[PDB]
Write a protein that binds this ligand. Structure first.
Ligand SMILES: CC(C)C[C@H](N)C(=O)N[C@@H](Cc1ccc(O)cc1)C(=O)O
Ligand SMILES: [Mg+2]
Length: 353
């Protein structure tokens, strides 16, 4: 098959509520939605959802880059994902959201051409994924109350955002555990807010609160400090901002920096690159959690879920971006409904539109 044309459009969707993390706030999911059409008529959908305080990418920059990529892959076979990434990598030294947008659309096309759900093409380990739901930074009693709400919706794993100071961060977790009890799994995410010593201190202070894992406790570049935390606590430590791509992953495995790694299609440039990170991690005995940017919609989330369902080593999931969307840009895929279970159907590719 051959790519005939590539179209992209801006999508700006308000979130039901501003989300606060240690890095800042997000109130609108602004993404680039791409449609790749083949000469035979098949259409693939992709998306680039950039998180400025994570990668620095912007919607305007992502749109321009996708157009450059699009005009360079005309005539290529979607299955030649190897050449498609080579072409994009030669065009741009860094544009994970734009690359993911193209990459996702190609995988959607592969699935449609093969007449198979994407999760079958990517590994076939399962046809669904169970996701947690993240609670944004707020006052202890508020977060605790929202925690009760989410658990009533059926969520058994909650991702707690922290990072305004260990004193308050500790109070947030205690209140949450106290409110929902110990039957719920609680994972913390500090989005780089703590120093290596404060991190150890906070984690130890929460020893009796049954913490599943702590995500990116220190600054992204502080790998010595991240490792310090990891080698100082029995609590599982996960890297997020410290790991963008396969190259970063190889570096972390080499140094024994963390216990688990957070994979985001918008950080690595798509499914093709994400698979590399998981293979490297799996070989090193490092499990992976599939994550997401708040700026992504059904397209990005559905793609991530198919990859997570497909791969055995991607044992955790944090795909809750759609739960906060006011509207859905396309039909099909993971819905806007706030629910832990994301069941992927039998529809070919992403099962979108
Ligand atoms: C609201 C949900 C989708 C947040 C998601 N689970 C998450 O925590 N993502 C990042 C943090 C983040 C990225 C981008 C934006 O705009 C806000 C927050 C993470 O730290 O895992
Ligand atoms: Mg994180």
């Amino acid at each position: 098959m051959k790519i005939k044309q590539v179209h992209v459009r801006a999508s700006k969707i308000k979130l039901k509520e501003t989300f606060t993390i240690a890095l800042g706030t997000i109130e609108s999911a602004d993404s680039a939605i791409v449609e790749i059409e083949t000469e035979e008529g098949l259409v693939g959908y992709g998306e680039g959802g950039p998180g400025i305080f994570i990668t620095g990418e912007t919607l305007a920059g992502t749109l321009e880059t996708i157009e450059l990529f699009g005009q360079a892959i005309i005539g290529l076979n979607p299955f030649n994902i190897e050449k498609i990434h080579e072409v994009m990598d030669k065009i741009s030294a860094f544009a994970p959201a734009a690359k993911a947008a193209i990459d996702i659309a190609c995988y959607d096309l592969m699935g449609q051409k093969a007449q198979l759900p994407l999760y079958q093409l990517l590994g076939g380990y399962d046809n669904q994924v169970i996701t947690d739901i993240t609670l944004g930074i707020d006052e202890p009693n508020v977060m605790a109350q929202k925690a009760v709400e989410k658990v009533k919706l059926g969520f058994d794993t909650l991702k707690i955002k922290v990072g305004t100071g260990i004193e308050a961060d500790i109070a947030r977790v205690k209140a949450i555990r106290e409110a929902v009890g110990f039957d719920i799994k609680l994972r913390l995410d500090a989005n780089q807010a703590w120093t290596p010593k404060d991190a150890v201190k906070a984690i130890q202070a929460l020893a009796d609160y049954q913490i599943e894992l702590v995500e990116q406790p220190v600054k992204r570049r502080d790998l010595e400090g991240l490792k310090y935390v990891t080698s100082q606590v029995n609590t599982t430590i996960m890297a997020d901002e410290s790991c963008f791509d396969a190259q970063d992953a190889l570096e972390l495995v080499k140094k024994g920096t963390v216990d688990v790694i957070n994979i985001k299609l918008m950080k690595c440039g798509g499914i093709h690159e994400a698979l590399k990170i998981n293979q490297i991690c799996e070989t090193a005995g490092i499990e992976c959690m599939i994550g997401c940017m708040a700026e992504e919609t059904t397209i990005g989330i559905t793609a991530a879920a198919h990859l997570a369902a497909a791969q055995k080593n991607i044992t955790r999931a944090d795909l809750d971006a759609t739960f906060g969307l006011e509207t859905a840009p396309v039909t099909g895929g993971v819905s806007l409904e706030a629910k832990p279970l994301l069941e992927l159907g039998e529809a070919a590719g992403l099962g979108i539109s």
